[PDB]
Design a binder for this molecule. Structure first.
Ligand SMILES: O[S+](O)c1ccc(Oc2ccc(Cl)cc2)cc1
Length: 134
């Protein structure tokens, strides 16, 4: 058993709050916000050795990142930002920091009851997204 066992599996989006405002703060344009905001992604998390893979799949976009905790990687986000990312575990929470153009956003993923709860923060704006097992 290991690090991220409680995260592994297939998850489906069940609620979102303030996601449009989070995307606005990040710089996402109108049409992308509208289509991205409609999406009901599945999130698929797997672990093989030290390598964690997170896939997001929806009618809007399919994305995939693979990484080792604490080891920076380059990421193209769903809204086409080219960012440098680092993901760590901090007290059982996966903490994902993305840096680009002198800006920074943090996405936190944690297990709470039978849910996977995602908090996205850009400056003073937070969005919360709740996933359940598929
Ligand atoms: O659902 S959560 O894992 C999750 C994944 C990524 C994310 O950041 C986005 C997503 C879409 C756009 Cl268009 C811009 C930024 C926010 C939440």
């Amino acid at each position: 058993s290991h690090m991220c066992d409680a995260f592994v599996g297939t998850w489906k989006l069940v609620s979102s709050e303030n996601f449009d405002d989070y995307m606005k703060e990040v710089g996402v344009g109108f049409a992308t916000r509208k289509v991205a905001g409609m999406a009901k992604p599945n999130m698929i998390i797997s672990v093989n050795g030290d390598v964690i893979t997170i896939k997001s799949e929806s009618t809007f976009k399919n994305t995939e990142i693979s990484f080792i905790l604490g080891q920076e990687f380059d990421e193209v986000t769903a809204d086409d930002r080219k960012v440098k990312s680092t993901i760590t575990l901090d007290g059982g929470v996966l903490v994902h920091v993305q840096k680009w153009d002198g800006k920074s956003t943090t996405i936190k993923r944690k297990r709470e009851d039978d849910k996977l709860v995602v908090e996205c923060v850009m400056k003073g704006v937070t969005s919360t997204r709740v996933y359940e097992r598929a």
